[PDB]
């Protein structure tokens, strides 16, 4: 719980400052992971957690498949 108080939320890390989209997702992927395997009521909370995107337009890229690119890691694509 100490993580979200120090680091800036990326609804304003992408809007106020403008560090680009691989850097904004890199800080935040492991934090959305542990909330989505916590509970089903916890699952619906972080997928709506978002704001304006300066670098990408979700007008011709399908936001269902676009956002799950950056949402997923290689923990769950490959398995041996």
């Amino acid at each position: 719980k100490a993580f979200e108080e120090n680091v800036l939320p990326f609804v304003e890390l992408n809007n106020r400052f403008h560090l680009s989209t691989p850097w904004t997702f890199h800080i935040w992927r492991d934090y959305l992971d542990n909330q989505l395997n916590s509970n089903e009521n916890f699952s619906i909370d972080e997928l709506i957690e978002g704001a304006e995107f300066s670098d990408v337009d979700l007008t011709k890229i399908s936001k269902d498949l676009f956002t799950t690119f950056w949402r997923l890691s290689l923990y769950d694509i490959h398995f041996d």
Partner: protein, 50 residues
Amino acid sequence: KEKIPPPAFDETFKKFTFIKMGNKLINNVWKIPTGLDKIEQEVKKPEGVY
């Protein structure tokens, strides 16, 4: 055959100076401003430069 006056001991401590640190080299470091608002101006828009 002299009259010796009583000695006056000094009761006054010395003053400090305007440099709140020791050197002028250390004190020039601790005079430049820090904070999130100065970084925000140069990162104004990447698309606006693009």
